[model samples]
Target chain A: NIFTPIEEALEAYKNGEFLIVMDDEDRENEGDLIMAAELITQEKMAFLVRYSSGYVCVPLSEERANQLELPPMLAGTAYTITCDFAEGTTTGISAHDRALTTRSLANPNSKPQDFIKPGHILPLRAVPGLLKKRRGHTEAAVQLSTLAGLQPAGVICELVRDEDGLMMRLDDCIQFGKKHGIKIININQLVEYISK
Target chain B: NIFTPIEEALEAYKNGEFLIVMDDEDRENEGDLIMAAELITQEKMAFLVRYSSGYVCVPLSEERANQLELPPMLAGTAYTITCDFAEGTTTGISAHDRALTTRSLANPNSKPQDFIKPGHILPLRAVPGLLKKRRGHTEAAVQLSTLAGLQPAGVICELVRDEDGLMMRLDDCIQFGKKHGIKIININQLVEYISK
Candidate 1:
């Protein structure tokens, strides 16, 4: 019953009973009529991230997106925390529009601030190599999960195979899974029922 | 017993029976000279980090570092790493004469690369911010032990809390010893008793 409405709409679009027309909306996600596509069948789209300037449309669930405050159209002073994906810097500001703001707000707390926990970081790669453009080890890539940040609600430093590789947003764990990459760890499942 | 020699030398210097001729050979660590001198007392010359750098110098003990042919050196490759610290892109190569160098080596048998385990990073701050001359939050700073490719065994995830902020590292647990800010999480203690 919950899927009735969505399933019905999908069927209508598939049956050709309703002609689907994509409207031209000039938004941050859209420029002009430079790109348009139609999925003739149920399939996933994989885009190759090149060195050139290009946009990556990572599909995320509405629930997770809301939790991350990553809406398609949002203004400044809207986000309380800005956790840099490229780096593990969780900044809390007083403004909703982060782009318009310039400074970071300090927290009056002691060690091990909220959401921080003590954990182990595996010893993995120690070789210095460029990770963005396949400089040294071009095929050297690693996939980490969002669960690393969850469960214990502490820190989970992943010693990637490469040095200072791409930093991923903590909230994109599910998105990574949806994109065919599973969490490199399953700590929650393993420690969900364990002794302290 | 190991510390007896240094202690005796320092006591003799303080008693005027001997004079400790401080070495000012390298100007690179001049910034820490004040702190180094202060640490010297009735005993030792207190080359805390200078002579200590050489005495404590270690070769790449981790299998990864050894297999990669990275030479042993004092301090770390932090200089090269700092260049691309905040950048999402990681370029881990530098042509420095001081950089560690070793003979040709190879990782035989083609082992799978490991991710960073838990308890590798020690946190000194909570909120991420831009401090005066400080990048703030050590952007991407994890358990130095793990980052240094130390610690081989232990849990894939562990949570720890102390004075200021929380930390997470993959696999082996790390500790921030008494009074000292730096941690030494090595492979010997991390990998001996791990299950699965």
Candidate 2:
């Protein structure tokens, strides 16, 4: 029912379906491939680390961040944890590149400490609307999903070097989604159809 | 009608208002203060060029970009033209750091080339929502406003080395908005109230 790419992307995102969002340059500028962090898999995470700049973890609460031993950040902030790829790691500690706040690690309830190691901590305040652009790619995806009244999610974006690379990344994401039972939609096609 | 900072910020933004969006570190991370090109003022643009890393111009169509004799960037790429303060007359020439896809002066529509020299041609694609983090701040602001069912706008964010510095930047934006009759809101206050 959407008559525009914006509307179509919003609709598909709200439906929890995956959509590839590209900028006018046809560059996969990240922030399009979004999904719930709770649904994250080592497989998907690995994929994100491989092809894209990295993934962002969004909608994380200060309390949770502290409990997770994250770095010192604003209590009122919505955080995005940057993730990259690593080889041969099953533990959560080395899987992502993140660090903990002194306060977070000091908290008595800190449990993920055993599971997570100290890494780089890049925390950002999150805008409440899922579709708002307050922080980075992760923040955008989670915010958009939340704005659509869906639960929070993460964003995995691959950098587009050229059109051929763009198509390869798109195919990879589509295949990955299918293998993981995640739905993927092409926003360009949707927008074109709507325009037509 | 606004109970929380997020709600209040969203309300103001929805009403064509301006809000200073910062990250968890309390640094106004540039992406949240968005406005339209047509709405930008020489004074405001000058201020943006002075303090922040710089501003970006987004959503520019490829045809227009090429017609303007921009460099050979990706097709459909939303570019961000970076701007900086120069101590001289407003010749619209080079005061910022950016490379042209080609010498824009050679284009037929490049008459204004002298008026808008290379101070801001850093175009970038914007995410649909307000929360995702992309490359530049200006892109985020424009993209967010558009996705929010509003016209694209410019974002003026100040670097936050300290709280006082941040307040100064915030005050500059607020006062500028006031002088310009633009609506300004504090995202910090909004999130605080929401947290409370």
Candidate 3:
């Protein structure tokens, strides 16, 4: 299928495989490289950073964001205070360090003290209704991981073309998915699946 | 004069020049590169980072720390949450970025939102009584700036020997002052002056 079945996308996400989520054309019309935060390894993070804008983000439910004391950086935006795990991380710039932060965010047991704010990984607070309230990539990624029965938090970064550093379009997203053997699904597919 | 007088040192500090503070032999017996946080410039900040333990610290009064919402990172130590001024800072790693964070720490009007926590610049809270309460370099530097009638916050880093990366002793600190034309002062002199 040109667009993977929502079931397959959910399965890929559960397996820690990189998944591409494309928002509606009427909306952002941008695709993001999404990964289950807990499953992210240094290698995967490095791989993800290489092809993207490198603006790393974690999509977490507002409840989880509040639990971690991640207030919004600015009002009217989901962007919260950036953070890195305080313990077991050094420099907080390297992929390895950021991977530790990403994985830690997915754990429900993570205490507020576990994170050091104003760090490398930016966390976007996903609204409660998620796809029902917003069809943005942040919402889509957060909902996907939730639907997969994995951690509600997921890491996402825009997939940009290396040649010009522009965000990849629907066609490029499809070709990259085929070439890389990863799944690319539209946000509507997720919305459709969840709607029924 | 090999070591600058406390009055002259205060004058130099108010003029935005770097001043050195040396603690007692009975205590740490180490010297620190000290500058009024408000007077620190990018060129000076870069120079400070080069010659010492690159661990940059801002010694802030307990009240300022509390107002900034900087809870101590540990119970026993005065090590508060590290921070970088959120708005203008980029990466929060460079000398220029850290200088802005340091300069902001000294400003009494700076709000808690002005900073991003867990940043490159670590803030050490000084007790209310400062040197009278604690004789560490942190307390000494904080007291010195307060005495100068400048902002109560100051920037400090251990002055270390380049040969072996060891802490620079009193003689080395004095010699460096002559070589660099910077004023170096002792903690006791500050205590004696504050005593009367």
Candidate 4:
């Protein structure tokens, strides 16, 4: 029986291989999101039989990765990300763990496996100067929290650094995000959906 | 002038300071798209004015200056960007300069001023690898190009890489997509109008 390409791709993907989905008519907004949704469903299904359930990590592929003098692996993986137009949200997924993402971003060249354990804290320079000044209610604060789903309860969050250069412990922050309702997306999943 | 905080932010943004937009609700997909659209517009406005007049050289904000992790400078006082979205289409601004963008992606540590120059050829690896590659010809390319106005001629382009590991080449890639003639969105203008 000859399976369709999509069907074959889906089967290969079930085994943990990479699958790329290409659609032109699907609007770009829904294009990637839907792709993510489809693959996540695939991975989730696969996760049940194959790997133990784990945190789905979302990695950010951006100018930082571009400017950091990275190797081809980082660029090949990270550069594909595109800023979301309709959602104004950025997303990238990782298969391993979010903790690794924290370490890698904080200290490049660190192996992803090293930070696999939870409660890892990777310190990164804050945007400097801009502390969380407006305590009560400010647009930026509201927007920031909202973008990351933080406004109402304790969503994915981190302590803001003000003095010297700003830095945050990303591992602790993301781990907290996991416990909360924040979705831990797989970096590969994000790439598969968004701009791979 | 009694300006809303958003308006004031836009005003300050005209001076070429770093502007970051966020969304909390995440409810309004349209709003997210609009905000992204606005950023594109604002940037373009600044660019046009500065390029035509050659009047002033905007100073970088300390906040932005510290975040040298990303592109710190542009050719003008502001920029015009368009945010296009489709469910399956690749909705992203084209690289303004493909070669320049490749260099930035290839060398993340180099400043925009340092890496890119005219007359460069961006390799396939350096290309954005569009957000959605589910389909080769029918889906990703044709749709994305149409959305960005690439169908028509007479638009300039520039592409660059940023710290976020994103490869962007700015072109009229999204300029003439005033509307989809037969589709729901003459959506491009909506992107343009909101940005301004």
In model 2, the number of clashes is: 56
* lDDT per residue as tens, model 4, A7-96: 343334333332221122221211011011112332332221121111112232222334432222211011212111111112212222
After TM-score superposition, what is the CA distance of residue A187 in candidate 4 from its true location, in Å? 36
At residue A170, candidate 4 shows an lDDT of 35
List candidate 4 segments past 4 Å from native. A1-90, A93-104, A107-110, A113-196, B1-144, B147-196
Return the lDDT, model 1, position B148.
29
DockQ for candidate 1, C-alpha atoms? 0.02
- The numbered model that scores best in DockQ is 3
**What's the TM-score of every candidate structure?**
0.16, 0.30, 0.52, 0.19
State in Å the error of residue B101, model 3.
Answer: 21
Ranked candidates, highest lDDT first: 3, 2, 4, 1
Better lDDT candidate (2, 3):
3
Q: Which ten residues in a row have the lowest lDDT in candidate 4 chain A?
A: A29-38
lDDT tens readout by residue for model 4, B121-185:
11111012321322111122122332343321011111111122121211111211122111112
Q: Give the Å shift of residue A193 in candidate 1.
A: 38
lDDT of 2 by residue, B1-196 (tens): 1112455445655664544543332323222344443334444443343333222243433344444444332222243232222233332222222112112321234443432323333434344433343334434455435444554444443322121222234445444555645444433443343343
The alpha-carbon lDDT assigned to residue B25 of candidate 4 equals 16
Residues B1-196 of candidate 3 have per-residue lDDT tens digits of 5467788888888888888887643334668899899988877776776666555778999888999998875432366766789888875755678888999999878999898866667788888899887777778778878878898898987675655445677788877888898888888778887886
Q: Mind giving the per-residue lDDT tens digits that candidate 2 earns over A67-165?
A: 454433211233332221222223122222221221232224436634322222233334443233234444455545554565443444433222222
Candidate 3 global TM-score: 0.52
lDDT of candidate 3 at residue A130, scale 0 to 100: 94
